Each structure stands twice: as C-alpha cells, then as structure tokens.
Design a protein around this ligand. Structure first.
Ligand code: ZN
Length: 255
C-alpha cells in the first residue's frame, strides 16, 4: 500500500477489507450538523514529563516516538474514560498548500494535519489497545501556512537526516507542548486509523483551532522520500487519505 496511482487509498480495501467499514476515518466535519454536547468535559493534556526518543522515516510518513513505559505524557478528560498515553506523533501533508489534511472542515482542506497518538493504559500495551473499540485517542490538529511555528523548527532541522525510508535519528528532549493551539475546543467522533491496518479503534478529537507554520517549514516536509536510499526518488507528498462516509455516526462539539 501507498499513495500512488497503483497502490493508493482507492486500492487498500483489497488487502484491508475494513477499508469500507462502518467507522472509517477521516471524515468531513459539517459544523452545522455537529451537535453541541454540554456533557463533554474539557480536555486534559499532561505533557510536561514527556520523553522523546527518536524520529524515523517509515516510508509513508515520519514518526516522533515517545517512551510510553509509564504515564509521562498523557491525555484524559473530554469524551475519554481513563488515561491515554502518548506513544507517537506524525503528520500528513500535500504537494501544495491547498491540500494535505485528512479531516476537512465544511469541505475546507488545510495544508497538513498533525496526529498525536495515545493508547488506553487499561489495555497494557499498544498492540492490545488496537484490538479495542476504545483502544486509542488521536488528537488531530490542523496546520495552515502563515507565520512560522517556533516549536516545530527542531523537527524540521532533523528531516535532512531521515530523508529516506528506514532512516531514524535520536530525538530527545522534544516537548510536544510547542505544537498546541491556544484553544482546546474540539469536535469528537468514533473512527479509525487512517493508514492500514485501518482498525476501527479510535476516538478522534479534532481541534477547532489550527496552528500556522511558515511556507519554508512545510517546504521541508515535501523534501522527504517515500523510497529507501539508492532507489528512484519518489517525493513524500500527498500522504493523506480521502474523506470517508459518516454513515449514521454523529460528530459532537465541546462548544
Ligand atoms: Zn495519522
């Protein structure tokens, strides 16, 4: 699987039949249809004790990994029940500023999308969580092009070192708190992983308020390669999946 013409999103259902399931992601958020739900609790992000370890190019994106052997970087509150631990974060981006996000707001597409992945500690490890309907919590944050994001610069400078598939780099003392918007107002719905195996185990929480990155910041993303070192160069762009049918599900808002 990939994002090309022959192994792209439209073809995933062949090896991953859950591709046309009832709770696939991403989706389009109809802000006029979302239900204001007064019983949602504010989100609780505890990231001050976060420990980053490395960044790697997995051939379809780049992941920043965190030590999740203890409750160091956790998510709770909101629509969640129990504690979710930060295991890793990645992005989806486009070839142009006009596309890149997975989730769309009134059909509007953003330059990129940041996904903060967390797993339910009641399940003991990430592999068990992905077997549960309440196994993960993904924190989705939109990126728009304007002013630079001071806090994202550290990531951008290290991409040179993981240009190709399989590369990884030590990436310590990276504080995720630098990638958060001022507001924590959100939309939430039941969904899935947006990349194979596309397991229907996620509780999506999409921030209303986007973060702005500079054009040169995002330009650096477009320079990564899908391919392994020594292979024809395939630039790592448009690694996002098209919006799926909502099918009955309801999108709720905390505002
Ligand atoms: Zn993702």
């Amino acid at each position: 699987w990939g994002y090309g013409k022959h192994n792209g999103p439209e073809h995933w259902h062949k090896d991953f039949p859950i591709a046309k399931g009832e709770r696939q992601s991403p989706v389009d958020i109809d802000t006029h249809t979302a239900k204001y739900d007064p019983s949602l609790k504010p989100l609780s992000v505890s990231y001050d004790q976060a420990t980053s370890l490395r960044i790697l190019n997995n051939g379809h994106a780049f992941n920043v990994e965190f030590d999740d052997s203890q409750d160091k970087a956790v998510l709770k509150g909101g629509p969640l029940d129990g504690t979710y631990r930060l295991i890793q974060f990645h992005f989806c981006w486009g070839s142009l500023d006009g596309q890149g996000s997975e989730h769309t707001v009134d059909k509007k597409k953003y330059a990129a999308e940041l996904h903060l992945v967390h797993w339910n500690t009641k399940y003991g490890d990430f592999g068990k969580a992905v077997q549960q309907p309440d196994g993960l919590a993904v924190l989705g944050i939109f990126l728009k092009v304007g002013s630079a994001k001071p806090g994202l610069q550290k990531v951008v400078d290290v991409l040179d070192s993981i240009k190709t598939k399989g590369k990884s780099a030590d990436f310590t003392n990276f504080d995720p708190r630098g990638l958060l918007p001022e507001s924590l107002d959100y939309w939430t719905y039941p969904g899935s992983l947006t990349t194979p195996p596309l397991l229907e185990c996620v509780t999506w929480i999409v921030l209303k308020e986007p973060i702005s990155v500079s054009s040169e910041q995002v330009l650096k993303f477009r320079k990564l390669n899908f391919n392994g070192e020594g292979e024809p160069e395939e630039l790592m762009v448009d690694n996002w999946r098209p919006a799926q049918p909502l099918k009955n599900r309801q999108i709720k808002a905390s505002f």
